[PDB]
Amino acid sequence: QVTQNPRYLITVTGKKLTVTCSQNMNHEYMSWYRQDPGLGLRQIYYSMNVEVTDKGDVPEGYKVSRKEKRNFPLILESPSPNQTSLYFCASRLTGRVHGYTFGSGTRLTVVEDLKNVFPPEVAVFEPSEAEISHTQKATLVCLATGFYPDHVELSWWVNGKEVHSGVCTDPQPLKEQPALNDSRYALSSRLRVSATFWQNPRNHFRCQVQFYGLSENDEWTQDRAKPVTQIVSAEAWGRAD
């Protein structure tokens, strides 16, 4: 197991940061990758062993250290917008087959101003009687709007249990103001059940958006609530025909 922290991170341009990576196994070789659309997995830096470090293919703006075998941290001295990426720590397996084991990724967004960061607003729209009549099925629509950056996880909860059946979610958020550099995002999802299930007023439906926001270490000076990591939900109850 490779352990990466943090999982999600927001920083302003120019503020130094460190992403940690440690492995429980005793491996000599560890490396850092960034994954960007159309550019695959690009090697930033690699460490063949304790106190041995070598620049990868795209080292500019990164530093590493390997004081200990267990840890291989990635240091961004002066984060720039272009370092907005998904980061993966890898260690090389020592078996006959030398595959890599990867951490679970760090989604880093580098922003001009923390004031650009907004949690989602979340609305649920109830099933159409027209759909119920035509199909004997009932579709709920969840709309998450106004969030930045695009760090969200949308889930559906029926009677207090997360569901997966009947769930279909937009594969990526859309920009609400795509003519503007700092556009906030919207994301939709559908949950479909039988008309019978929807018609039972004991049934409770909740769409949950997990937003990954500012941390305690981030300074906040805006009037509006600090956009910290939080859940925003919208709910509906079954409606009797």
């Binding site: 951490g103 990724g105 997966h164 279909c168």
Partner: protein, 203 residues
């Protein structure tokens, strides 16, 4: 040509179809590795092929290593929503004992098989908490595409992808919304986007 060429880059298939994806090089590899990656996760190693010409099976997945060790295929029988993800091939190419090169992957989307498409646009009732009117385009065939757009007041989503763990009520949909008064579902979902025989029931 890259060291490792994966084809196709993007694949959209329907539940129950079979599929084969390819990993090709002009270089001979001692071994090739396959990884699967899901959103919010790191790549996970599936199998390594080492012997020229060999087959390895991992459940519904079959991996072949070419006889010349320049190629590998990944075959899936009866695709399921759980198969959706990024399939990477990797090897020690270009003067590396320690550095893996990763192909660009095949990004596999498993869409529902809709035997009887019944394309329809439903006008939803307003939410007390939003100024938006919302329109649901649903029950269309998985070969029908909807691409995201913003055209003045009118937003349209890309068509959704099944929850990987969905085991029922697997159907296609896109939504449109606007905050303009008098918004018409027919404005968003016009003949450039939807099937000509799409049903528009009145509320």
């Amino acid at each position: 040509m890259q060291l490792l060429e994966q084809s196709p880059q993007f694949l959209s298939i329907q539940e129950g179809e079979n599929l084969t994806v390819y990993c090709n090089s002009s270089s001979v590899f001692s071994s090739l590795q396959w990884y699967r990656q899901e959103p919010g996760e790191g790549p996970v190693l599936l199998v390594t092929v080492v012997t020229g010409g060999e087959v390895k099976k991992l459940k519904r997945l079959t991996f072949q290593f070419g006889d010349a060790r320049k190629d590998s295929s990944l075959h899936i029988t009866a695709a399921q929503p759980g198969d959706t993800g990024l399939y990477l091939c990797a090897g020690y190419g270009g003067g590396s004992n320690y550095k893996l090169t990763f192909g660009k992957g095949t990004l596999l989307t498993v869409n529902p098989y809709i035997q009887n498409p019944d394309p329809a646009v439903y006008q939803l009732r307003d939410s007390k908490s939003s100024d938006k009117s919302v329109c649901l385009f649903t029950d269309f065939d998985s070969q029908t595409n909807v691409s995201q757009s913003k055209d003045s007041d009118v937003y349209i989503t890309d068509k959704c992808v099944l929850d990987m763990r969905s085991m029922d009520f697997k159907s296609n949909s896109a939504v449109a919304w606007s905050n303009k008064s008098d918004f018409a579902c027919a404005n968003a979902f016009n003949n450039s986007i939807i099937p000509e025989d799409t049903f528009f029931p009145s509320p």
